[PDB]
Design an enzyme around this catalytic site. Structure first.
Site, mmCIF file in Angstrom:
data_model
loop_
_atom_site.group_PDB
_atom_site.id
_atom_site.type_symbol
_atom_site.label_atom_id
_atom_site.label_comp_id
_atom_site.label_asym_id
_atom_site.label_seq_id
_atom_site.Cartn_x
_atom_site.Cartn_y
_atom_site.Cartn_z
ATOM 1 N N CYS A 186 0.772 -1.204 0.000
ATOM 2 C CA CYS A 186 0.000 0.000 0.000
ATOM 3 C C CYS A 186 0.831 1.295 0.000
ATOM 4 C CB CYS A 186 -0.977 0.011 1.147
ATOM 5 S SG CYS A 186 -2.096 1.450 1.096
ATOM 6 N N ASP A 208 0.049 4.072 1.436
ATOM 7 C CA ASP A 208 0.012 4.746 2.741
ATOM 8 C C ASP A 208 0.485 3.877 3.875
ATOM 9 O OD1 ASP A 208 -2.337 3.236 3.900
ATOM 10 O OD2 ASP A 208 -3.545 4.593 2.699
ATOM 11 N N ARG A 243 3.226 2.764 6.390
ATOM 12 C CA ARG A 243 4.482 3.373 6.873
ATOM 13 C C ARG A 243 5.626 2.355 7.079
ATOM 14 N NH1 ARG A 243 1.420 7.117 9.125
ATOM 15 N NH2 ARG A 243 2.249 7.747 11.152
ATOM 16 N N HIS A 268 -2.139 -3.951 5.227
ATOM 17 C CA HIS A 268 -1.851 -3.502 6.597
ATOM 18 C C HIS A 268 -3.101 -3.013 7.320
ATOM 19 C CE1 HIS A 268 -1.408 1.029 5.845
ATOM 20 N NE2 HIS A 268 -1.906 0.487 4.751
ATOM 21 N N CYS A 290 -5.470 1.259 7.606
ATOM 22 C CA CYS A 290 -5.055 1.588 6.234
ATOM 23 C C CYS A 290 -5.955 2.666 5.755
ATOM 24 C CB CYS A 290 -5.155 0.354 5.314
ATOM 25 S SG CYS A 290 -5.029 0.648 3.509
HETATM 26 ZN ZN ZN Z 1 -2.948 1.461 3.263
#
Ligand code: ZN
Ligand code: ZN
Ligand code: ZN
Ligand code: ZN
Lengths: 180, 178, 180, 178
Positions: free
Chosen positions: A9, A11, A13, A61, A64
């Protein structure tokens, strides 16, 4: 040179390097393999037909923002169109997601999303063809939790069309058993 | 929470997270912004309009498989079509690149490529609109043990900065000329 | 069943049927073959590899709203992104288009656009591969004028990579001769 | 000048211009509106936001090669990926379709397909936004010597009309049941 394609993804981290130069990496919003996305498909075709990468990992994750945004259904503009594929996935599993308490659905949808993207990857002409011509190729769907720092191989591991259909079926059924 | 969108290459050895949770990351082959790629455009539109990210970094890299593959022009199948945009950029600068010696050409194209993709990014409806309504937004083009370009803050400085990068790249070092 | 794929403009009022069930038809704004447009490419791959269609015609037209909109450069929203490919084509031929009087440029860009889309079609992996494996396949770029009701085979006819490169070169050079 | 956008199939024998300069036309394989297809989305956004077109017609047709190809599921190459969205819609309605006899299944899927693509069209950011700001815009799903569905004028009537088409299609004629 590289032996794993990871689809993760935008976003998230945690980077894929950390949660695993072994790696060839695609990232997009909500770690999707959309049937007709030239960008992801290109990557997959290159990884499989040219680099002969033998493992593909789709990693989702928890917490999300892409998932949360697909679920809240605000007028975000162009990205809403991207996120509609995830909305189709919520409604594919609507009865299952309605049983859960609402603070729990996102994390369920996150795991279900990973299984569905694996299923899509397995259905591409590129992966079907590789499996048909004997090429050794495995798909995995994982979900990472940074509340923990920890992982769940999300029930979906596939090495042929046969094992994709089966492992897809059982992942969803394993996700349908509810923690009281 | 995130302040930077990084558009980087899928074959890059190094995490964009060299250079944590300040990064929103998109990775594709040869770090492209194709005018009509729903995938990259979606990421950019979300970063800009929704997350309010104020910096977009296109980060290319030397010894890039995708660049090399676009130049070798073998029949790789589907990926050839994706790499066609790279060959367009090669021919846009064909006189330039032909003046380098063969073994230097890849690394020039890598640099040119970043400049071209920043120019594309700056001409998106997303970015143009964000500049037009006064939103603070800067675009950067870098090439990655050091980070060796283009910097835009508005449509006028995009134009300036893109034309300067190309003229700057057109000035050939003796050690690179053929 | 069908022997021609026609790629024509969405805002052309002459249909391809009229200006020619022979026909398989794609239409999009400004009759483009964009390298990575899954929609057009899909069509082309199906026409060539499955239907074994032996002729592809890209047909543009004068007084074309997609061309005019790419040239005026208004904030139209999403469609501007689509039309950027045409803007790249204007600047590929900027010196040539600047010599003309401004009421004449659109019609020049329309013809140049057709040559460039043919060149792109000829460069797809699908068409390159068909020509490499001996398949009989011809590409044509036409421009239609409803001020007349009439046609110009726009200098671009291709039957191999060889004839594509040549016919592309000469079409542009033929378009660069200016009517005083 | 144009008042109608027609989204029709590339293999249809008949010009959408059966049924002149009132039509703006998009043609693709199996008359799809895929959520993330830049090509079809661009056409729709231009029709709606720029040309002010007040009607969008998705017109499918029986004996559709693309529908048949999606069901036969041979290895056709690239087009298989485009047709995957059709196979998703097949499986979304798998219990329904399995209750038909084999030779009736294609024409049911053709009808279902149109309904599904109208639902997609109505859920685009383009169309939703146009309805939200009061723009007059109607969507239609038809199947093509006669024109044999779905009609939407707002997000609530899209939902109503889509659910009704599916329930209406779920009611099986004796001559079609297996
Ligand atoms: Zn995500
Ligand atoms: Zn690279
Ligand atoms: Zn036109
Ligand atoms: Zn059809």
């Amino acid at each position: 040179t590289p032996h794993y394609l990871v689809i993760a993804c935008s976003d998230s981290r945690v980077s894929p390097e950390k949660l695993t130069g072994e790696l060839f990496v695609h990232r997009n919003v909500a770690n999707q393999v959309i049937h007709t996305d030239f960008n992801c498909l290109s990557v997959v075709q290159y990884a499989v037909d040219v680099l002969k990468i033998e493992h593909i990992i789709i990693c989702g994750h928890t917490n999300c923002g892409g998932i949360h945004a697909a679920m809240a259904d605000k007028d975000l503009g162009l990205i809403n169109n991207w996120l509609l594929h995830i909305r189709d996935i919520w409604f594919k599993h609507g009865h299952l997601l309605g049983k859960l308490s609402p603070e729990k659905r996102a994390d369920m949808l996150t795991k279900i999303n990973v299984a569905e993207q694996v299923y899509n990857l397995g259905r591409t002409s590129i992966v079907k063809s590789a499996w048909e011509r004997g090429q050794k190729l495995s798909l995995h769907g994982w979900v990472y939790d940074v509340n923990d720092g920890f992982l769940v191989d999300q029930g979906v591991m596939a090495t042929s069309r046969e094992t994709l259909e089966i492992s897809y079926r059982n992942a969803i059924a394993r996700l349908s058993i509810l923690d009281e």
